[PDB]
């Protein structure tokens, strides 16, 4: 039956249904609008009234305007017919190539796979990225979090990673743009058409695109992550394959929540966040997973606000992850790229029983030599290097060489750092950092290790300096 708007505050709308009140999470349709304004129920306020969070701009709403329940939550197309197509939060396609034609549709709200459905297999995923593959390497069908403050190297890293893994992948891939720049889609789309992963002429298309950028109102940014992951859910369960899920930016989900929580009638938590931050993230994140029916490798870039790693948003995100790769501004401003903190990044896979004890013992050695260098950094900060002992003088010199050998020229970094992009095989990375640790290169200068692929290029780089 019909329901009447009795109140409008921001993106939070109040609808009164005299007949048969619609449940929570149901998608409503507003009449008298030029384009489909969807309202998603959040709560029943009593007296035949519900509270809903809009899916678009609320400008031009009259107190009285009729609304119609759709007897279902928000529904979107899924399956192979969505590949090579961009759609918004509510399923409407936005690449202007006609509507998306399928038989199969799904709801963007779903329960998390039951405990029994969880997988326990742990196998490494090589990336060709040195700082990652050595110290915090991702696992096939694992949860990958790319933490980073403003302008530190997330969207660039997650693009390199696509170029590395997504292109040379057998199964399908889903990209979900959540609350980032719109041109960041127009870049990805035209770059992907160019590389063939999106095919316009035929349908050999491999990647599915969903967007809800920072132009979209809170409600849309709040649910657009769900839209994407639901498209990914299908390729995991209903077809049972190796799905790659990419999300940028996962923070905009909790930020958008932050934006409406006030108006929803909550009392503000820490940092003025939604009190429901804990569970809002849980139910949504636990879906993005590998099951016994299929596997999802999930790379999610995480915006850190005010470089505050203790902000309730990035700090709650850790708990949901298998591999955390933390990007640091200090590292970035030292001209180290990728700006990955080699002591704050961790992988649940770093276990000799998986990566091999030879991998593990080089990762633990590099971390020890770097922790020791960092703990001497407060004494050198005042005194200068001259004052160290002759034992420590060496450890400093190696750690610094290691620091720069952890830097790497990416292929997506080419078109502004002038250097040819590089992927490094895992045997070359382990053997590389072993030799620096073993003292074979105590004679090469530090900058010879700066921005190079394999270790054999450091030797080449040192010879150049004649």
């Amino acid at each position: 039956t019909t329901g009447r708007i009795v109140a409008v505050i921001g993106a939070v709308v109040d609808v009164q249904f005299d007949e048969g009140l619609p449940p929570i999470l149901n998608a409503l349709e507003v009449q008298g609008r030029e384009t489909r304004l969807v309202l998603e129920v959040a709560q029943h306020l009593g007296e035949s009234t519900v509270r809903t969070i809009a899916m678009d701009g609320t400008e031009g709403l009259v107190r009285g305007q009729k609304v119609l329940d759709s007897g279902a939550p928000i529904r979107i197309p899924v399956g192979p017919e969505t590949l090579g197509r961009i759609m918004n939060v509510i399923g409407e396609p936005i690449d202007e190539r006609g509507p998306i034609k399928t038989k199969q549709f799904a709801a963007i709200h779903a329960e998390a796979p039951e405990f029994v459905e969880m997988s326990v297999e742990q196998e490494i995923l090589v990336t060709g990225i040195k700082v990652v593959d050595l110290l915090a390497p991702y696992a096939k069908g694992g949860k990958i979090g790319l933490f980073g403050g403003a302008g530190v190297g997330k969207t660039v890293l997650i693009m390199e990673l696509i170029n590395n893994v997504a292109k040379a992948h057998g199964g399908y891939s889903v990209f979900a743009g959540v609350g980032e720049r719109t041109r960041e889609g127009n870049d990805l789309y035209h770059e992907m058409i160019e590389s063939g992963v999106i095919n316009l002429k035929d349908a050999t298309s491999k990647v599915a695109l969903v967007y809800g950028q920072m132009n979209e109102p809170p409600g849309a940014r709040a649910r657009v992550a769900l839209t994407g992951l639901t498209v990914a859910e299908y390729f995991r369960d209903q077809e049972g394959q190796d799905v790659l899920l990419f999300i940028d930016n996962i923070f905009r989900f909790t930020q958008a929540g932050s934006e409406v929580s006030a108006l929803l009638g909550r009392i503000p938590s820490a940092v003025g966040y939604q009190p429901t931050l804990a569970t809002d993230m849980g139910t949504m994140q636990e879906r993005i997973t590998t099951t016994k029916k299929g596997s999802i490798t999930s790379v999610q870039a995480i915006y850190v606000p005010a470089d505050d790693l203790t902000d309730p948003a990035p700090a709650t995100t850790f708990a949901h992850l298998d591999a955390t790769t933390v990007l640091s501004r200090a590292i970035a401003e030292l001209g180290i790229y990728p700006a990955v903190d080699p002591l704050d990044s961790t992988s649940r896979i770093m276990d000799p029983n998986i990566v091999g004890s030879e991998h593990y013992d080089v990762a633990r050695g590099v971390q020890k030599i770097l922790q020791d260098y960092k703990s001497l950094q407060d004494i050198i900060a005042i005194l200068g290097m001259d004052e160290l002992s002759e034992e420590d003088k060496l450890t400093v010199s190696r750690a610094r060489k290691i620091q720069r050998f952890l830097s790497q020229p990416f292929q997506v970094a080419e078109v502004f750092t002038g250097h040819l992009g590089k992927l490094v095989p895992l045997k070359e990375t382990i053997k590389g950092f072993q030799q620096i640790l073993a003292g074979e290169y105590d004679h090469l200068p530090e900058q010879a290790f700066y921005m190079v692929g394999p270790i054999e290029e450091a030797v080449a780089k040192a010879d150049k300096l004649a």
Binding site: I5, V6, A7, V8, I9, G57, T58, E59, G60, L61, V62, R63, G64, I86, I94, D95, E96, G149, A150, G151, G179, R181, T182, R183, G185, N186, D187, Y189, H190, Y211, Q213, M214, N215, P217, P218, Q255, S258, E259, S261, A262, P268, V271, G272, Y273, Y303, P305, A306, D307, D311, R329, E333, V415, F416, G418
Partner: protein
């Protein structure tokens, strides 16, 4: 029962204070519908409640009493747009404040519009010329791109904007409609003298003729300051959606932030980080998205944005600055430690980057700026040691020599922008070594000397770089000719 006042198109005002007016009635107003007050003052219908309408006042609250008659307008907060504004100064609403009569506005646009989606765009390609050497070479801005000016107070932020505005006259003096650039300067939270002294300066440089100024100074009501950027943004979008190229400068968003924080806190919305409301990211997200480069099918028009941010003591990690770093397609940092040193423009080269602006630079510039950026990092490769004269090495002492000259060259006077070829000529001077001998104390004097000489005598050689967009072997060798004999002639 009734034969007089209606409650569907009219209000009453139940209470007024704290900026908001609770209005009784208004039964068929919309969300963000503009309303009028019995005193001529206009408001925005922000809240729609079962027993009242919450209206934000665009002016002094003192003018409104309980019982005032509130009237509809039907139009969702719109602003006068078009070409009848070029050379005019208007308020956040779009009313003439320069006292030069009314605008002859033939078109209107909404302040609360959405940015173009994924398909209507294309990767920036057209050169947005600043006229400043350090920017156009190292931090190249492109038409359709967002570039951030950020730094502490009194560090040259505003100056980068204006010299860029003065610069565009060299294109608007042309007839080529596809290379012209129209300007919009949005002043928020400033002193009314600072805005007034700016339009005078813009006039004395024949810049105003292609410029729209939106002013909501410190004295203006907080929501006027809030509305201001969006209003002028739409005035920019007009050119973008017409296949013309426009430029908007938001000076500045930090002052518009405190304005909106005032609104949110007066509204009693949950104070969060630095007391800022949950949607101060959104405030600047929806606005700067609206700067875009449209593909040819959409008309090939571009809106290019230069928003300003005032840091406190160099703190970039702060909430508001980090947000805008995460909105914009690149930054320009202005360190107080270079400004209060004499280096102007005070651009931190080791921190400022322009993401999508590289493939929008002149090739002739790339031929000189590429090995300039390379040797400038080679100089910034820790040369803080400084004092020793000739007590260091051999291969590293020349990098100290090159740096300071390539640094002095980037110094530039105010209100004096340079054509792209005039830049590649003075940069050519240091980047090849034709300044290595010269005393650092003199590089400034040498520039003005050499620069006005090639302006005077060698317009033929300048025109042959401009047209060719490339430093040809023929021009390169004819330019070697010019710097060598001028340098020998030069009297230090």
């Amino acid at each position: 029962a009734d034969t007089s006042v209606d409650l569907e198109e009219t209000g009453r005002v139940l209470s007024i204070g704290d900026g908001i007016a609770r209005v009784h009635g208004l039964r068929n107003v919309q969300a963000e519908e503009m309303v009028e007050f019995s005193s001529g003052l206009k408001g925005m219908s922000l809240n729609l409640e079962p027993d009242n309408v919450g209206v934000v006042v665009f002016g002094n609250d003192k003018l409104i009493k309980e019982g005032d008659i509130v009237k509809r307008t039907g139009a969702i907060v719109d602003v006068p747009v078009g070409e009848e504004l070029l050379g005019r100064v208007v308020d956040a609403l779009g009313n003439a404040i320069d006292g030069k009569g009314p605008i002859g506005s033939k078109a209107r646009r909404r302040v609360g519009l959405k940015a173009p989606g994924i398909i209507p765009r294309i990767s920036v390609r057209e050169p947005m010329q600043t006229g400043i050497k350090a920017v156009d070479s190292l931090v190249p801005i492109g038409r359709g791109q967002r570039e951030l000016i950020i730094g502490d107070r009194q560090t040259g932020k505003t100056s980068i904007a204006i010299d860029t505005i003065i610069n565009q006259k060299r294109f608007n003096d042309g007839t080529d409609e596809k290379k012209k650039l129209y300007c919009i300067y949005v002043a928020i939270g400033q002193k009314r003298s600072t805005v007034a002294q700016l339009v005078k300066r813009l006039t004395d440089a024949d810049a105003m003729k292609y410029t729209i100024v939106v002013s909501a100074t410190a004295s203006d009501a907080a929501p006027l300051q809030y509305l201001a950027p969006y209003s002028g943004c739409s005035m920019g979008e007009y050119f973008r959606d017409n296949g013309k190229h426009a430029l908007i400068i938001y000076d500045d968003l930090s002052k518009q932030a405190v304005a909106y924080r005032q609104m949110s806190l007066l509204l009693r919305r949950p104070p969060g980080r630095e007391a800022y409301p949950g949607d101060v990211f959104y405030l600047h997200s929806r606005l700067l998205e609206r700067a875009a480069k449209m593909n040819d099918a959409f008309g090939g028009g571009s809106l290019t944005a230069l928003p300003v941010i005032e840091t406190q003591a160099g703190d970039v990690s702060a909430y508001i600055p980090t947000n805008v770093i995460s909105i914009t397609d690149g930054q320009i940092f202005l360190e107080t430690e270079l400004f209060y040193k004499g280096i102007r423009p005070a651009i931190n080269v080791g921190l400022s980057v322009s993401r999508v602006g590289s493939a929008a630079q002149t090739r002739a510039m790339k031929q000189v700026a590429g090995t300039m950026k390379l040797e400038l990092a080679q100089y910034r490769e820790v040369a803080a040691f400084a004092q020793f004269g000739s007590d260091l090495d051999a291969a590293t002492q020349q990098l100290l020599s090159r740096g300071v000259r390539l640094t002095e060259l980037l110094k530039q006077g105010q209100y004096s922008p340079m054509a792209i070829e005039e830049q590649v000529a003075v940069i050519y001077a240091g980047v090849r070594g034709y300044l290595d001998k010269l005393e650092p104390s003199k590089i400034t004097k040498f520039e003005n000397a050499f620069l006005s000489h090639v302006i005077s005598q060698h317009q033929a050689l300048l025109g042959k770089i401009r047209t060719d967009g490339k430093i040809s072997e023929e021009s390169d060798a004819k330019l070697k000719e010019i710097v060598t004999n001028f340098l020998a002639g030069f009297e230090a």
